[PDB]
Amino acid sequence: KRAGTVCSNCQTSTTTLWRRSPMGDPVCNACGLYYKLHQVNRPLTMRKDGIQTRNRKVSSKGKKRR
Template identity: 60%
Template sequence: MWRRDSEGRCICNACGLYERANNGQKRSLRQTRGKAPYKRPNQVCSNCSTRSTTMWRKTENGEEVCNACGLYYKLYQKHRPLELKRWLDDFFRMKFLQFKRSYKLLQIILKNELVVFLINLTYIPL
């Protein structure tokens, strides 16, 4: 079903009902933006010293901590060890490097197999 807006343009039913109920047009998808990591100027996690996080939390002591440290504190009632942060960073870095290395290796293997395949096609035994 199609409707007319306040300016006489043809719009879909959902947009027409929204406009009539809210006295205004719906925002287009182009105007919306995704969420960026939440940064506060000069804010640092009191536990791991990170500056960007999806959400800032407070411990029972009133300390401002990042989301990861806050959830860890909520679950275990102790501060998140710094080794855990370094271990996770190293883990993800290594996984990325392994993926990158295996992808390059796969490209080389496929390229070599293609060359061998083409050589076998052109080779005519006597």
């Protein structure tokens, strides 16, 4: 349900991937990772209208996992 999905933590709506918070509050891929690592509400001063982009990270597959 992307339609209407707004980041509960920073209200952004241009997320690369929609994540969910432990409380069930929709969040943008950035808040979900930043929040999980620091578990604190970050000011919207880091929110950017459009999505930032960069040269694509080297192409890599993966490794076998236990």
